Paper text:
Here, we characterize bacterial CE protease activities, revealing K63-linkage-specific deubiquitinases in human pathogens, such as Salmonella, Escherichia, and Shigella, as well as ubiquitin/ubiquitin-like cross-reactive enzymes in Chlamydia, Rickettsia, and Xanthomonas.
Due to low-sequence similarities, all structures were experimentally phased (see the Experimental Procedures). The crystal structure of full-length [name] revealed an unannotated N-terminal domain, in which eight helices form a superhelical structure. In bacterial examples, the analogous region is either disordered in the absence of substrate ([name]) or not part of the crystallized construct (RickCE). Mutations in the S1 site of [name] confirmed the Ub binding mode predicted based on analogous Ub/Ubl-bound structures. Interestingly, deletion of the putative substrate-binding VR-1 region alone ([name] ΔVR-1) or removal of the N-terminal domain including VR-1 ([name] ΔN) abolished diUb cleavage, suggesting that the disordered sequence indeed contributes to substrate binding. Ub binding was unaffected with a [name] L46R mutant, but abrogated in a [name] W105A mutant.
Author numbering: 15 to 136, 151 to 340
Amino acid sequence: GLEVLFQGPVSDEALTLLFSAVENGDQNCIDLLCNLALRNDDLGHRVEKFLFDLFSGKRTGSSDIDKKINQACLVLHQIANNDITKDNTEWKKLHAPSRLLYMAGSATTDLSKKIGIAHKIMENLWCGARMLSSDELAAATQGLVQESPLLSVNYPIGLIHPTTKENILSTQLLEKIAQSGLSHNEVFLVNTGDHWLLCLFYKLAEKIKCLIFNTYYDLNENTKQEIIEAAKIAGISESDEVNFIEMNLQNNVPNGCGLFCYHTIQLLSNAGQNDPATTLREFAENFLTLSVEEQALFNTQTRRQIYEYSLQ
Ligand SMILES: [K+]
Ligand SMILES: [K+]
């Protein structure tokens, strides 16, 4: 029944058939899966994505298919570190930032066998406590909203410039207003040391509303004031109109401030006709009712879905 994988463009159904076979099969089906995702052709590309979507939680799967993927990742790890593969740098999937190389590098805990892999992708890319860089966050948050014209995300900045003490959020706002104006929803991602803040500017019928989403410990009145000063540039009247939503969610999600910024923008993109403050506050409250494992799974899955934008 798997003969259809080699007959013309591969159906989304034929792919589910493949992973159904892997779920119920043994080492042959795993080896077949790896062989197919290693291909340069369109079929290899389709298999590679479907596999990555299951590896990242973008597609749900049985707990049995997750265990097959862990094996596929280990097989690819061994192929990526094999001497034959290293001698043939023309094999793009094994020498470039690919989904396949990322999955391969997630197979052990020995960094000694992830060095070359990491270099080809760009250091421990698979750490669950990585404080996200601005470029990595910029790629993911903006790719996330390509199909949402009403939702605009800006390049991640710091709140205050180190060598001049100037409000950068004040300048980014000014420039965005001059360059394109403020969209229906305007997202600004602002760094305050270790922390990424989600600054959402949204209009409620000719009335600008501001909203700050903090997923760590609460903020200093100093940093809060610098934000408000910037917030007033966008047409916010008095400091009381700025809504600071602050709930620490980063106990079991270390340095996950950028992770929550990403997932938040996704929530806003899929619930367009609603209230941002409610959408976010309900998430943060619901997130605290989850188990340690459900949170650690969010940590892992969001990190993998984020880095996909830094891959080909
Ligand atoms: K957009
Ligand atoms: K705009």
